[PDB]
Amino acid sequence: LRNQSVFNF
Amino acid sequence: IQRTPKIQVYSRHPAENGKSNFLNCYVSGFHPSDIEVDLLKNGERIEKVEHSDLSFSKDWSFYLLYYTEFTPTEKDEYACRVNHVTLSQPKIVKWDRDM
Amino acid sequence: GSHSMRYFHTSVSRPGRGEPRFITVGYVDDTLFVRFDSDAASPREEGRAPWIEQEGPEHWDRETQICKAKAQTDREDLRTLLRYYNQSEAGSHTLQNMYGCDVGPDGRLLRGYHQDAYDGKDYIALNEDLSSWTAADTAAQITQRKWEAARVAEQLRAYLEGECVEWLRRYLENGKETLQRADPPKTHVTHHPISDHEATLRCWALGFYPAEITLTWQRDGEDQTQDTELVETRPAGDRTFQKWAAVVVPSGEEQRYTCHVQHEGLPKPLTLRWEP
Numbered sequence: 506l507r508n509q510s511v512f513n514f
Numbered sequence: 515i516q517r518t519p520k521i522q523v524y525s526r527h528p529a530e531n532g533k534s535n536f537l538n539c540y541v542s543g544f545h546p547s548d549i550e551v552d553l554l555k556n557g558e559r560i561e562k563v564e565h566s567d568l569s570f571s572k573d574w575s576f577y578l579l580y581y582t583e584f585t586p587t588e589k590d591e592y593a594c595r596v597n598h599v600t601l602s603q604p605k606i607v608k609w610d611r612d613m
Numbered sequence: 614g615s616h617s618m619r620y621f622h623t624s625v626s627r628p629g630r631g632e633p634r635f636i637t638v639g640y641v642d643d644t645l646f647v648r649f650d651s652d653a654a655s656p657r658e659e660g661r662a663p664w665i666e667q668e669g670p671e672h673w674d675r676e677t678q679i680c681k682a683k684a685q686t687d688r689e690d691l692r693t694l695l696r697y698y699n700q701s702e703a704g705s706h707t708l709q710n711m712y713g714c715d716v717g718p719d720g721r722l723l724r725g726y727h728q729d730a731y732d733g734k735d736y737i738a739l740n741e742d743l744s745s746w747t748a749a750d751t752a753a754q755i756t757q758r759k760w761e762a763a764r765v766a767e768q769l770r771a772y773l774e775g776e777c778v779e780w781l782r783r784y785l786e787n788g789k790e791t792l793q794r795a796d797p798p799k800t801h802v803t804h805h806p807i808s809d810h811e812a813t814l815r816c817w818a819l820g821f822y823p824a825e826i827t828l829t830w831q832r833d834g835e836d837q838t839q840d841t842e843l844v845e846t847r848p849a850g851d852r853t854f855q856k857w858a859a860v861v862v863p864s865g866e867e868q869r870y871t872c873h874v875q876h877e878g879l880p881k882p883l884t885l886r887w888e889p
Contacts, residue, residue, distance in 0.1 A: 506780035545733035
């Protein structure tokens with residue numbers, strides 16, 4: 506199951 | 515900046531003349547990911563060769579498996595031909611049923 | 614015994630040839646179970662193992678949506694990195710990310726991972742504490758400052774210790790037939806006279822799973838670490854792996870050499886010699 510969280514550099 | 519591929523050519527099962535098998539060309543340890551791999555039969559490109567999905571090792575270098583079903587004979591020669599940005603010319607590695 | 618789940622992601626820009634290609638794959642140990650490719654006819658998270666096929670349509674929509682949103686964030690991040698490294702917009706660049714968890718035989722968390730690389734080099738990694746970062750350079754420190762301000766490590770820790778471990782446990786149970794079966798290596802030693810002064814001894818291991826293995830040669834009971842040629846472990850294409858180790862021996866001294874094989878599938882390490 507993937508992590509649904511989104512993070513940008 | 516860049517890492518040249520390591521190349522291994524081998525069969526899925528031990529080679530037996532006349533018995534169906536798979537010819538594999540495993541390329542690993544390379545960067546960047548773009549790479550051209552051909553499987554050769556008596557120096558000519560085998561058509562419809564399949565390949566695994568791009569993945570990479572702990573050190574970020576990439577690896578791919580290229581494969582085709584084949585029936586080895588005594589007289590047919592097989593090889594893998596690789597081109598990558600790190601190579602001035604295509605690198606050919608012959609299938610040696612002992613490697 | 615111990616198990617891992619990992620998701621791998623690669624974005625490769627190609628200026629002048631459309632948008633970056635995005636490919637992501639998921640593994641449990643050495644078994645691929647899902648893939649997503651932005652260049653596919655209908656890009657979606659696709660099952661690649663029988664034990665994942667039981668997951669419902671809701672599951673596949675969830676994973677597909679995450680892949681599509683990760684492909685977009687990666688395109689944005691590739692633009693960001695051009696700025697951080699003062700680079701031209703003309704060249705092709707690569708962004709890689711790997712995250713996941715390791716569990717023991719008891720299914721308890723051993724360690725969590727979340728790490729990124731730019732153009733094949735370390736960029737930023739979540740430390741083992743799941744609370745602090747290792748930035749490779751002053752460009753990654755900009756991302757570190759942003760990620761500390763946004764408490765990203767806390768969000769990652771919650772996933773790695775929660776969903777990651779529970780779903781790894783679920784997949785190990787659903788796939789117990791294969792994921793929890795070790796296939797020991799099939800072994801043999803070959804001999805190739807090179808000349809009349811030297812010969813090659815090659816020790817083989819075939820048909821094993823998982824990929825982790827140790828093959829070593831000894832001469833009179835002493836490890837031949839420097840004089841051994843070891844090929845990288847390689848996939849056979851039937852889930853199993855292969856490996857060989859070779860030594861160049863002085864003619865007539867073959868019986869002084871022994872090959873040693875260690876693998877999860879073996880209750881005891883194996884000792885082999887060239888027969889006859």
